[PDB]
């Protein structure tokens, strides 16, 4: 078919933080070689993860601020394992330099320019919660209905969480971005504490106010839910406006949602930058070759699409993968590592073309399709260069005119690079753009990123 796809660089929506993933619960430790990785392969997997040149160029990592008592299974261990005695006793803190592999992981990524960890909790400490458990849900002694006979941990959390930042800053690794809830609305046997949008906005505050009374400058985040619907239940609680004239939205610079019980595919009701911090295929089924067969939850193409709605209907500035590699033969991680051997999926690849040009700060532009075969996002870099992502859910090739429209400079050449069953990120021949318009033909079922060159 025939589609003409414009781009307008003046009608310019939200900006990008970037893309991403975590290595949370000891997966850290498979990029290191925990089930037989070779260096080779170890130094390789942190490439395509990290090198804009070599690889993906995440800009996130997403590690989590572990609640537990011990290393056992796949048990991410705490700053503060065990009951000082009470909430006012001297915290007794441990720091091992390791955090479950995510801080040298940290470390070989902000090596090869990785700006932006976030570090995100799971739960506090079990004696910190009415349950006296890190499991199971459970709510932290002192928040809004939630009293305890052993008193008021809320400060306690506060003083904890920022512990953790100052170990990773003494150690020479600043954290950018700090979370103290996961999927409150979830009951598991792992990791867990729930609470409301009111809960959440009664520590928003004491959290930011307890990090200016320290000086410490950090990003918070809020209340990495569910889904996206879930976390959207959650904001009008983050803006109620306290006696004090402040709502914890006026904390926060970053509000956050999964997307597992609904996806995003609709904007946020905050003022403030939307995130999706965690996605990926739980089904246990394993597609690492496909980028389309029958739409399966683990394809490429699901992923190429499941990104562009993100930033084009749900305006969100980042996308964040659940975990980068792990030694599974699952889609719950990007890269299958099987003992010795790497296997980047199509979605891996779908996130690289993204991630790869559409760089941090980085401004979403309009961009329409003639056809509604091929769905297309654009954005334009600090530094001039035009990313434009076009999915071909057409079972033939489409012919595209690309328009795009008036540009500080001329544009002269244009590259694209392909995702599809027989290409994981191609780099093809240039095309000249005439008149800031150029003819190029994309594959049946595929993923093109076409990038301005100068
Ligand atoms: C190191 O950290 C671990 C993990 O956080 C701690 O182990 C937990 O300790 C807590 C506190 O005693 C235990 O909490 C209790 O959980 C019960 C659930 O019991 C069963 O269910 C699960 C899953 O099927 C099994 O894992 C478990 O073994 C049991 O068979 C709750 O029913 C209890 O609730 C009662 O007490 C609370 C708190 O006072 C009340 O609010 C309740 O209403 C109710 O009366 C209780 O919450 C937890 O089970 C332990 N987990 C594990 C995995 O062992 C260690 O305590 C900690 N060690 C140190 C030294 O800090
Ligand atoms: C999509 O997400 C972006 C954030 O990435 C949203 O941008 C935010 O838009 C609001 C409302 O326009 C801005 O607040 C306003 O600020 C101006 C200038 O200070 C002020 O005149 C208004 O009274 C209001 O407070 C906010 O600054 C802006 N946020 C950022 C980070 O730029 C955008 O609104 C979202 N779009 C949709 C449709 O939800
Ligand atoms: C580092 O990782 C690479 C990439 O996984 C390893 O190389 C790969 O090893 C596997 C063997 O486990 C090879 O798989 C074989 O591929 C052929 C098709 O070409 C297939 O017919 C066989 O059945 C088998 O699956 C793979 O080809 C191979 N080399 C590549 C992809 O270049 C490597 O062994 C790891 N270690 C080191 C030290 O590099
Ligand atoms: C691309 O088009 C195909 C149909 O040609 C869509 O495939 C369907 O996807 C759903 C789940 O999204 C499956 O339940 C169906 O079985 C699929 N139909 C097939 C294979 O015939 C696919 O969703 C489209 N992808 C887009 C628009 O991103
Ligand atoms: C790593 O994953 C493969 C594939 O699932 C599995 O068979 C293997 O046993 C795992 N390695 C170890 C050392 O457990
Ligand atoms: C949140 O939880 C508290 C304590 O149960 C309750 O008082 C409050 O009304 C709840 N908030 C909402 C918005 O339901």
Redesign the pocket.
């Known amino acids: 078919i025939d589609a003409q796809i414009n781009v307008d660089l003046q009608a310019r929506y939200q900006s990008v933080d970037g893309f991403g993933c975590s290595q949370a619960f000891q997966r850290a430790e498979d990029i290191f070689g925990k089930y037989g990785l070779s260096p080779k392969n170890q130094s390789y997997v942190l490439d395509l993860m990290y090198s804009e040149e070599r690889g993906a160029g995440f800009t996130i990592l997403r590690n989590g601020i572990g ?4 290393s056992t299974s796949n048990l991410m261990n705490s700053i503060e ?3 000082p005695g009470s909430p006012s006793s001297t915290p007794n803190y441990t720091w091992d330099h390791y955090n479950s592999g995510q801080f040298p992981l940290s470390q070989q990524a902000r090596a090869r320019g990785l700006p932006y960890i976030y570090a995100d909790a799971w739960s506090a ?3 910190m919660k ?7 849900s ?1 709510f932290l002694c002192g928040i809004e209905g939630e009293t ?2 052993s008193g008021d941990w809320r400060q306690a959390y506060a003083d904890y969480l920022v512990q953790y930042v100052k170990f990773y800053a003494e150690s020479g690794v600043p954290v950018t971005h700090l979370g103290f809830l996961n999927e409150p609305q979830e009951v598991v ?1 792992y990791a867990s504490m729930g609470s409301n949008g009111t809960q959440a906005a009664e520590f928003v505050k004491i959290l930011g106010q307890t990090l200016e009374r320290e000086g410490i400058d950090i990003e918070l985040t809020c209340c990495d839910g569910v889904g996206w619907s879930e976390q959207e239940a959650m904001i009008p609680g983050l803006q109620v406006v306290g006696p004090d004239g402040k709502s914890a939205e006026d904390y926060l610079s970053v509000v956050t949602g999964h997307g597992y019980s609904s996806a995003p595919t609709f904007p946020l009701s905050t003022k403030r930058r939307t995130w999706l911090t965690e996605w990926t295929d739980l089904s246990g089924a394993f597609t690492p070759y496909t980028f389309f067969a029958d739409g399966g939850a683990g394809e490429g193409m699901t992923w190429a699409n499941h990104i562009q709605t993100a930033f084009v209907n749900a305006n969100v500035s980042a996308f964040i993968y659940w975990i980068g590699a792990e030694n599974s033969t699952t889609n719950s991680g990007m890269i299958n590592l099987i003992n010795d051997e790497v296997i980047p999926s199509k979605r891996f690849w779908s996130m690289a073309s993204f991630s790869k040009f559409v760089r941090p700060n980085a401004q979403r532009v309009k961009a329409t399709s003639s056809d509604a075969s091929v769905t297309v996002s654009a954005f334009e870099n600090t530094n001039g260069v035009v990313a434009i992502q076009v999915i071909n859910n057409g079972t033939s090739a489409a012919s595209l005119t690309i328009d795009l429209g008036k540009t500080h400079k001329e544009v002269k050449k244009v590259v694209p690079w392909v995702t599809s069953n027989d290409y994981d990120l191609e780099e093809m021949s240039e095309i000249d753009v005439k008149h800031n318009s150029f003819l190029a033909s994309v594959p049946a079922r595929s993923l093109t990123s076409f990038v301005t060159e100068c």
């Not at 609640?67 to 011990?70: I, L, R, W």
């Not at 009415?130 to 199971?136: A, I, K, R």
């Open positions: 609640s537990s008592n011990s394992p065990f009951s400490p079990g004696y009415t349950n006296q458990d890190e499991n199971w459970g305890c006979p046997s």
